[PDB]
Amino acid sequence: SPVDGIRRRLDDPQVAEALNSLLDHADLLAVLVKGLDGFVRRGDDIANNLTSAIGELKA
């Protein structure tokens, strides 16, 4: 089975080592995605900030 093969890859010492190092820095990945979610959910505000900034340079 192909799913069996992914489990087989997970056994690989080198694959496992890399996956473990990814889970060691999963907090950083989580925070960067949370930061991106924040940036996206405040994208309208950042757009209004760039609008007020350009609008000042217009005046």
Partner 1 sequence: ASVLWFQGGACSGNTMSFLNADEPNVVDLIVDFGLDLLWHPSLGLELGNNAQKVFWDCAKGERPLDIFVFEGTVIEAPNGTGQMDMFAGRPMKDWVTDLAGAAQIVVAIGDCACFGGIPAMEPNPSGSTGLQFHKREKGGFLGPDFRSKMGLPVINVPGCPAHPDWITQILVALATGRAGDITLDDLHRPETFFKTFTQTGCTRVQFFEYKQSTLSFGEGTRTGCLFYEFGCRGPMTHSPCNRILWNRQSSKTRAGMPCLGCTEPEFPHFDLAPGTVFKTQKVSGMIPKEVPEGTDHLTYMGLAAAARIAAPQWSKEDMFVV
Of residues 5, 20, 28, 58, which one binds partner 1 by CB under 8 A?
A: 28
Nearer to a copy of itself, 6 or 53 (CB): 6
Rounded Cα distance between 26 and 4, Å, is 25
- Looking at residue 36, its amino acid is L
**42 binds partner 1, rule: CB under 8 A:** yes
Listing DSSP states for 8-37 in one string gives HHHHSHHHHHHHHHHHHSHHHHHHHHHHHH
Rounded least distance, CB 40 to partner 1, Å: 4
When CB distances are held under 5 to 8 angstroms depending on the partner's kind, the choice from partner 1, a copy of itself, none that residue 46 binds is partner 1
